Each structure stands twice: as structure tokens, then as C-alpha cells.
């Protein structure tokens, strides 16, 4: 009070000193049920693949691509990534996901990698240098043990032109050893650009169905369309917190209310265009919003000449969010409530006045 009034001796009265404010302690983040799961199931266990070179591409759109099902299973065999860190895939949003898939054998899993080129570097699907993604290759020897060794996934071999990153080597050009073109069926040094499958169940361990679904990522300037789910905290009530709901973000308490919103209605506003009601994302309960307690601090002093003990008056605040005596204008901390009525000496508000009487103590 002396610091604000710029003096050393003050007289009787109620002086304004400062303005206190309660700060939010914790933070609550609420997101609704995780719906619209990305259909990543059909990418692994489905109908047969077209061919090795004729691989099919499946783009990704706005969805919820959860990764807790890929690196948490045992049906796969290889999960070696190339700088992806699957432990943090739930907190990373991408825009371009390439769900390449084809059929290879057990010995061709090694030849398909950015660090090991060769047979699959210029004759079939090639991989770039960066290749932000993980290779998913599992042993498909569960029911792909048909008789006769059906060779329908014929991979094109001995091709001249090198294959491009994320492309297909579709070229019906016969193998020419360096002579005149035959333009026929295995003529003068001619070989049709096709190789024979047929990895029968009684052929070998290395020659087995090993359908691999190659997966990669790519970032662009477009907004994040594909990303994993988000987290959610526990609901708290009757406390000045900082809520972080789906669309709203602010501070204030979150108590119960008797208001009833329409099915489509989510938010809630007052006459002065201020947020005062919110709806729970997870459950169905209208949560009321009320700003936390603020206001100025006033002191009731009997004058530094007589004595030096003073009181404080937190104006407008309840006495639970701060001897103590709840008045109609705050909580007068530092005074006793006497029943005898006297003349008003120091005005406080709503009739209640203070004075320095008898052992000497501030009365209200």
C-alpha cells in the first residue's frame, strides 16, 4: 500500500493495491471416438497379386491410419525400415503413401532393398535411395501350395532399359543378343521377355510364396491427408484448468449443467458472443464453462499512526479459491464478525463496514 501510494504514512480508508488472478494448474485434451479407420486390412490378406512387374498401386486419402497393428503382429517375417522409426509413426503425418505389392520368393527378399540392388534394380520394381518406408514381406506358404506350380506372376527379366523409381517394367521386346531382330518366337538369338514361376510346395524352402507389400512415404506441400490417431486425457471438474477440446481452446472451469443441446449442436455461446458451454467429445454430456476467479485486492487500514496491522479484501472472490468471513463483496481475511452494530467508519460494500475497536483488532 505504501509502495502504491508513494508515501510512508497513510490514513484510514480502503485503498486499491493490486489485481490477483488464479492460474490454470493442469491441461485436459479431449478427442472423440477414433472412427474412420483406414482400410489397411485388405492390403495384406486379399485376392492374389496381378504380377511382379504389373504391381498394383493403392493411394491413400483422408483416414485414420493406425500403426499399432503392423509392428505388433507375428505373421510377418521382415520389418526392416530405412529411417522410419516405427515407435514414432503415431506422431507423424504424411501425405503420400505407396502401397506397392507383388509376389516374390524367399531368396528375392534380399534383392529388394535400397542397400542391395541387382536382379530387382533394372528388371522389376526398383527402390529409391532415400525410400522413407518399411518393407513388409511375410511367408505366404499357408495355402499357396497348389499342384502343378501355376506360373502366372511372370516377372520380366533381361531387360535393357533400367527401371525408374516407383515404376513398372512393362515392355514387350524380345531379348536381342546383338544380332538382327527376329520379330518372331525365339528366332535368331531371341528370347521372349518372360520368366517361369512354379515354386511348388515340393520344390524348396527358398522357392516359396513370399508376397511382399512394399510401403513407403513422401512429403509434399499439400496438407496432411493420412495420419495416425491422437491421444486423450481424463476429464476433470471443479478446477481452473486449460481445456483443449477438438475445436475450442481456452481456460476456465468445467462443471456440470442442466442445458440440453440439439443433436447437431456442439458449441455454446452467450449474448456477448463468448464461449460459455461445450459438449464432451467422447461421451454425451454438456459441460458448462465459467471463467476463473479474478479481481483486485484492497486493504482496510486504520491509519499507520494508531496501529500497523491491516486486512485484505479479495473483491468478488469466494473464500474457497483463496479470520475468514464471506461477505457480499468478497472475503475479508483478517477481521472478526461482531454482531453489535455501530456507525460506519470504513466502507467495504453492501452495508458491511470495518473499524479498529476492542485486545484491539479489526472488526467487521
Amino acid at each position: 500500500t505504501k509502495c502504491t501510494l508513494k508515501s510512508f504514512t497513510v490514513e484510514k480508508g480502503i485503498y486499491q493495491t493490486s489485481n490477483f488472478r488464479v492460474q490454470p494448474t493442469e491441461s485436459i485434451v479431449r478427442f472423440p471416438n477414433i472412427t474412420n479407420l483406414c482400410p489397411f486390412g485388405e492390403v495384406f490378406n486379399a485376392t492374389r497379386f496381378a504380377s511382379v512387374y504389373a504391381w498394383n498401386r493403392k493411394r491413400i486419402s483422408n483416414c485414420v491410419a493406425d500403426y499399432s497393428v503392423l509392428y505388433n503382429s507375428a505373421s510377418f517375417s521382415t520389418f526392416k525400415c530405412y529411417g522410419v522409426s516405427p515407435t514414432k509413426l503415431n506422431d507423424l503425418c504424411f501425405t503420400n503413401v505407396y502401397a506397392d505389392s507383388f509376389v516374390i520368393r524367399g531368396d528375392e527378399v534380399r534383392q529388394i532393398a535400397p542397400g542391395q540392388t541387382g536382379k530387382i534394380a533394372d528388371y522389376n520394381y526398383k527402390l529409391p535411395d532415400d525410400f522413407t518406408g518399411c518393407v513388409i514381406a511375410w511367408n505366404s506358404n499357408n495355402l499357396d501350395s497348389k499342384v502343378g506350380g501355376n506360373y502366372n506372376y511372370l516377372y520380366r527379366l533381361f531387360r535393357k532399359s533400367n527401371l525408374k523409381p516407383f515404376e513398372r517394367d512393362i515392355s514387350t521386346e524380345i531379348y536381342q543378343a546383338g544380332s538382327t531382330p527376329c520379330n518372331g518366337v525365339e528366332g535368331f538369338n531371341c528370347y521372349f521377355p518372360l520368366q517361369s514361376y512354379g515354386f511348388q510346395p515340393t520344390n524348396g524352402v527358398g522357392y516359396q510364396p513370399y508376397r511382399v507389400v512394399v510401403l513407403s512415404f513422401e512429403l509434399l506441400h499439400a496438407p496432411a491427408t493420412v495420419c495416425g490417431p491422437k491421444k486423450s486425457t481424463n476429464l476433470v471438474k471443479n478446477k481452473c484448468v486449460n481445456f483443449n477440446f477438438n475445436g475450442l481452446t481456452g481456460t476456465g472451469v468445467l462443471t456440470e449443467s442442466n442445458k440440453k443441446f440439439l443433436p447437431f449442436q456442439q458449441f455454446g455461446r452467450d449474448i456477448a458472443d463468448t464461449t460459455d458451454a461445450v459438449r464432451d467429445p467422447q461421451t454425451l454430456e454438456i459441460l458448462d464453462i465459467t471463467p476463473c476467479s479474478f479481481g483486485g485486492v484492497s486493504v482496510i487500514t486504520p491509519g499507520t499512526n494508531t496501529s500497523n496491522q491491516v486486512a485484505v479484501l479479495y473483491q468478488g472472490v469466494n473464500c474457497t479459491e483463496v479470520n475468514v468471513f464471506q461477505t457480499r463483496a468478497g472475503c475479508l481475511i483478517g477481521a472478526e464478525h461482531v454482531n453489535n452494530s455501530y456507525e460506519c467508519d470504513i466502507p467495504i460494500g453492501a452495508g458491511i463496514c470495518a473499524s479498529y475497536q476492542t485486545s484491539q483488532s479489526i472488526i467487521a
Partner: antibody
Amino acid sequence: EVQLVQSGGGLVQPGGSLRLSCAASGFTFSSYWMSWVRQAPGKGLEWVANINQDGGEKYYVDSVKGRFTISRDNAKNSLFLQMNSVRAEDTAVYFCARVWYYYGPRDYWGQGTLVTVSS
Amino acid sequence: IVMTQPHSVSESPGKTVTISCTRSSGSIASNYVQWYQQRPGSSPTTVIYEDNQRPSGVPDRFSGSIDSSSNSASLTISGLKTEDEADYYCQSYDGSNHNVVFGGGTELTVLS
């Protein structure tokens, strides 16, 4: 924050066995796999067996396949490993460790159980 | 399938001495490679996992690479001091029958 403890055996004998219990506490024991790894005195490490979330699959190794029973109660957050017909080469210290993900390492290990067979 | 590893190794505080871990069948670039450290008289702890990367807490001196030449791996442990004299093991998921194969161990010591 994660501090795992385990006990339930100080001495065993051929024929009569017990059940090792690994108390799960600290972390969230509802989204992680479990597997046992034993260590023989003067040797390296050996993978005993694995276990799914609650009751999915119980993968065993071909060495102890048919004489070891693993279990896991996801309700009470406990890991039980019961033995039967203890052999002679099973003298090793067993460790309890949770699996971050099926293709990753073990985050937190246990403390060790001195289970030895001696006449 | 077995994981080969040198039995013992000893040197003086100074340059780094890597530890090799050569496989027997399959590919080394098909699964991750982890390195554990087992202090004598306590429980093992993870030092480096996904050798191309390294976790927190452990100093960055512990480094490791991948050698796809003959399906092997290397753990270039730099900064040889007294607080690093312990045992180390090799581990890599290779068994298609849901089997986790481990290494043999080492006896890396110092010269005092």
C-alpha cells in the same frame, strides 16, 4: 518410473516344480508383449518363450516344447510361468522383460531368480 | 542358426575397438540388430537398438553400423574407459518360427 520385481523360488528339485510370477507395475500393462529370457551360469542368453496380449498365442521354443506352461492374466496385471518335470540343463537364472514391439528390443528387464537344481 | 561373436578382447584406454557379430544364414538387412550390456551381478540393459539410430541416456560414443557384405554387424564402442568395462551381447530376430536368437557374449576389458 518402471521398476519390475519377481520372485517365487529359491530351490527346486527334479520332478517337483513351481510357478514364477512377474509382478507388472509402473507402466501400462495392457499394450505390450511379454517374453522370458534365461541366463545360464558362465553362458550367454537364451530365449525361453513368448506370450501374446491376454490369451492370443503362446509361442514356445523347440527345446522346452512340451514341458513348460506360460500364462498371463491381463486383468490383475501379472505374468505367470509354471514349470513341470524340470530337466538337468534347466539350471539357469530367468529374467522378466516386457516387449516394446514384436520387432524391437526389451525396454525394462527384471531382477533375476536363482533357480538351480542340486541333489 | 547361430550368432558368432569373439569370446574376449582387451586393450588400453584410447582408440575404439568394434565388436563383430556374423550371422550364419539369411540376410542381416532384413531385421533390426540390437546390442545389450549385462553388468556382472545385475540385470542387462539396452545400449543401442536399430544401430542406424541410438536412444537417449546412453552417450553418443557408443556407435554401430551394418555390414551387408557377409551378413554381419559391428558395434564401434568409442571412448574406452573404466565405466564401460563390461559384457556385451548380440541379438537379431531371424527365426521364422517365432524364435529370438541371441549372441555369445564378449569380455571387453581394459589395461591397467
